[PDB]
Structure 1
């Protein structure tokens, strides 16, 4: 089987560059301004010109400006990025029926029934890159390997504007020398748990007792790592369907006053409904991020679809249940809809 992974480099910032090409070569920083005070918020994405100096996703905007005071800071325009992304995904469908749209800037293509050997794959890759650069002016990195995981790892190693193949031989080596923390799907939390279990490389997962490994990171993640270690991971490329939709908004000031929170809650509901479009949810959850950044949620599932009027009234009951089951002030408030009919 042969998988080709496509990752759009520093996507949000690149799109801003395509929409205002005079930004090329300058440090571009796309941010989420939370509006709690001047420059409150964080960097969502930055191009290479800014990343090389340490300005990257997650760094507070204020901190970023101390490092690059003259870089260009832009607000996130998510809908534009999504429309651009969709056009690019369509260009990719021309290369394979079985395509998995992993995120706004990632997609996997199963080009087995389309190419033989890793020479034709590399060529199909260049073909895809040039195509995208031509039609949308966007640069992408391509990763090629036997499964989705190593296809992703190859791209991570070739970014930006790169292409890389990880053959069956490099795979076996990586299973020995790659930091377990560099394996997709393994975040910060899991990484630390594995180390304390004595696992720093994939190969090490085979030296531990499965019911011990499973006890720490869970059955699903355990089998995931074991499969990868034995060079047996072969999940099929298939695009999943959105299981839920929601919106969470940061309030100007923290508080626990119902009448002060409702406006934000309603704003979030209105936006979530617009996004739902023609989907009718049967489940609603209200989510509150407290002052100490801890998240509390309460939801309800109905035997039928939820109208917007039902959403408004139900969301207040859930928020009240939340304010009741926790004395902490709230900082962000929002909702999520799911179980679409």
Structure 2
């Protein structure tokens, strides 16, 4: 193929922490960490200022505080983020031939019909969707536009934050050529590490 589809992948930037910045404007520009407990605590999401100090999703709060003492630490308020996500997903629904809500902050839009297979028009539609989420919900997102869901996410991972990544039908074959298996969504570190011990590092191996 590389035509039967025109996909727009949408991925919200540092979502939980960003929603918190939207609600408390005074957090913006400062290291911020949303915390999750499941007894003991870990980082759920850190905004960029906090990631810049080395804070990462999954890091124990104790180790986070040790490296980012000056950060602000708040509790996870899932209901509210679900509320935001809900609204954004519904908004996306209105521009898609078909929609896959992969998670609270990830969604795939099939828009081949919507733009009658015109690729360039798909890009523009994506751009308009970036802006529409920024205005209606004040949240910035990163998107990827490609011929299929898989490529749409990869280009998107490479364009954050706040990006618009594109892989036109014509640049696909060679894109795959230099793709690290490592970069394919769903290929976990465990499978990746095992292929590596076998000297398999790229899609062409």
TM-score after normalising by structure 1: 0.57
Q: In structure 2, what is the equivalent of residue 8 of structure 1?
A: 12
Deviation at 1:6, TM superposition (A): 0.2
Aligned residues: 200
Q: Gaps spanning 5+ residues in structure 1: where?
A: 205-341
Deviation at 1:52, TM superposition (A): 2.1
Find 1:20's aligned residue among 24, 41, 52: 24
Q: Which has the larger radius of gyration?
A: 1
Cα distance in 2 for residues equivalent to 1:173 and 1:31: 41
1:149 aligns with 2:147: no
Deviation at 1:174, TM superposition (A): 3.1
**Structure 2 counterpart SS, 1:112:** coil
Alpha-carbon contact 2:112-2:118 (below 8 Å) kept:
no
Q: In structure 1, what is the equivalent of residue 89 of structure 2?
A: 89
**Structure 1 counterpart SS, 2:10:** strand
Q: 1:170 to 1:97 in 2, by over 3 A?
A: closer
Cα distance in 2 for residues equivalent to 1:10 and 1:141: 10
Question: Residues 276-303 of structure 1, C-alpha deviation per residue, up to 9 Å, x if partnerless?
Answer: xxxxxxxxxxxxxxxxxxxxxxxxxxxx
1:181 aligns with 2:182: yes
Alpha-carbon contact 2:88-2:137 (below 8 Å) kept:
yes
**Structure 2 counterpart SS, 1:43:** strand
Deviation at 1:135, TM superposition (A): 0.8
Alignment of 1:1-341 (within 5 A): 1-35=5-39, 40-115=40-115, 116-204=117-205
Q: Which has the higher contact order (CA 8 A, sep 6+)?
A: 2
Cα distance in 2 for residues equivalent to 1:184 and 1:33: 27
Task: Output the aligned Cα RMSD.
Answer: 1.4
TM-score after normalising by structure 2: 0.92
Q: Gaps spanning 5+ residues in structure 2: where?
A: none
Displaced runs of 4 or more, over 3 A: none
Cα distance in 2 for residues equivalent to 1:52 and 1:170: 33
